[PDB]
Write a structure and sequence with these properties.
Blueprint lengths: L7 H15 L3 H25 L6 E3 H5 L5 H10 L1 E5 L4 H17 L2 H7 L2 H5 L4 E2 L5 H7 L2 H11 L13 E6 L5 E4 L11 E2 L5 H4 L1 H6 L1 H4 L32 E6 L10 E3 L5 H8 L19 E2 L6 H4 L3 E2 L8 E5 L4 E3 L9 E5 L3 E3 L1 H16 L26 H5 L6
Parallel strand pairs: 1-2
Antiparallel strand pairs: 2-11, 3-5, 4-14, 5-13, 6-9, 7-11, 7-13, 8-10, 8-12
Helix pairs in contact: 2-13
Length: 409
């Protein structure tokens, strides 16, 4: 279930020499993939200079009524991201914003964090280690959020070789954190990156099965929405490991989101991973390096090794309290360093996780932390909400809220 390598630099030299032999024309393949990424980069910059946003936008009512056309789905799968509006009523989402604020003010969350290490003393928090607020629990179990997540999961190819790699019609809940960012606040440093593994995409054999069409030279056949092999990838044991397989990451806007307001940026290129994988196999890269990728860190995309992709960094469309935005698990994303806007940028991290044997194993340990009010196993054991006034319990759960947490009822 996990990857174990003692000497990583030596393994990189061995694997790169192994990949270069199986693909002796690795430079010819890269310059053709670069041509496919270049035209997408230029198409993205055409829209931004024109007044449009390259991130596709949909309304939740269109999804629920079944009005999404096949061309809208093809644009989501090519961009690898989607902003979905009106998932929750704006009146409730704006109230959810002030409920979490009162939830933190009531239990004195600021002083608790300080009282709970010099490096811990440094860490004005903007990402909050709370997981069981009433707005968080209620939004995960909303029927409109569930229908949206079912639609996103049905964009994937779930079946191959007589095997259903996940259930796109069943949804599980992955408890995550929340973000509250005020204007003129300090940057976090979330440079363009990809979550879910870094050098493991080259070293682990299960990862190379997902990207087998890239390493074989037939890059045109690589589908970022093919589920085969993705729940079986191995990562290094690190705090940056998500125990669940998420088809789409995403959050819900508690406050209006604006450009140059310290909010999310994305590179809307679904197959950008093909460019990154073949980039590290070129000759201007040292034999022991995979373009700065490090174990235990998110796969970084920089101006030094990927100047073409940096040109396509696009802000997300303007959102209101109640709109959501999702992006593929291989999509490069980042957060604006400065918040020069007026309204704060508060979001709730709520991804889209389908049912599979891998995700089902995480539910019992996740539910145990909910009943206790502790932190989920994938996060630092802060256990802030153990004695919190107003913490959401099982009494706050609906029938959908219990089926998605593994509760049998
Ligand atoms: O835009 C945010 O709120 C954080 C984005 C991010 O780094 C993530 O969710 O992985
Ligand atoms: Mn991230």
């Amino acid at each position: 279930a996990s990857l174990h390598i003692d000497d990583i630099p030596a393994a990189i030299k061995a694997v790169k020499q192994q990949l270069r032999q199986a693909l002796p024309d690795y430079q010819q393949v890269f310059q053709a993939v670069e041509e496919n990424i270049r035209q997408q980069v230029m198409e993205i910059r055409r829209n931004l200079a024109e007044g449009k946003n390259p991130v596709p936008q949909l309304h939740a009512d269109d999804i629920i009524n079944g009005k999404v056309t096949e061309e809208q789905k093809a644009q989501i799968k090519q961009r690898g991201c989607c902003a979905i509006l009106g998932v929750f009523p704006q009146e409730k989402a704006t109230a959810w914003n002030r409920e979490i604020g009162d939830y933190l003010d009531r239990n004195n969350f600021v002083e608790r964090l300080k009282n709970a290490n010099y490096f811990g003393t440094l860490a004005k928090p903007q990402i909050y280690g709370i997981y069981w607020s009433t707005p968080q629990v209620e939004a995960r179990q909303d029927k409109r959020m569930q229908a949206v997540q079912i639609f996103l999961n049905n964009l994937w190819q779930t079946e191959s070789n007589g095997k259903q790699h996940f259930d796109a019609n069943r949804v599980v809940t992955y408890a995550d954190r929340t973000r509250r960012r005020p204007p003129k606040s300090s940057s976090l440093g979330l440079s363009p990156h990809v979550d879910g593994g870094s050098i493991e995409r080259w070293l682990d054999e299960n990862f190379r099965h997902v990207y087998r069409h890239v390493f074989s030279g037939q890059w045109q056949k690589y589908d970022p929405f093919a589920a085969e092999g993705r729940p079986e990838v191995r990562e290094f044991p690190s705090p940056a490991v998500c125990s669940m397989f998420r088809t789409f990451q995403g959050w819900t806007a508690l406050t209006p989101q604006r450009t140059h307001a310290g909010t999310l940026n994305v590179i809307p290129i679904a197959n950008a991973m093909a460019y990154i994988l073949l980039r590290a196999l070129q000759d201007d890269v040292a034999d022991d390096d995979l373009c700065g990728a490090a174990p235990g860190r998110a796969l970084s995309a920089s101006e030094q090794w990927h100047p073409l992709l940096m040109e396509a960094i696009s802000p997300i469309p303007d959102l209101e309290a109640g709109d959501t935005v999702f992006w593929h698990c291989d999509v490069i994303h980042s957060v604006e360093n400065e918040h020069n806007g007026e309204f704060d940028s508060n979001v709730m991290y709520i991804a889209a996780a389908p049912w599979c044997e891998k995700n089902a194993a995480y539910l019992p340990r996740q539910l145990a932390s909910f009943i206790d009010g502790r932190s989920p196993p994938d996060f630092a054991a802060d256990d802030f909400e153990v004695d919190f006034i107003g913490r959401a319990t099982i009494k706050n759960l609906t029938e959908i809220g219990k089926q998605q947490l593994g509760i049998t009822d």
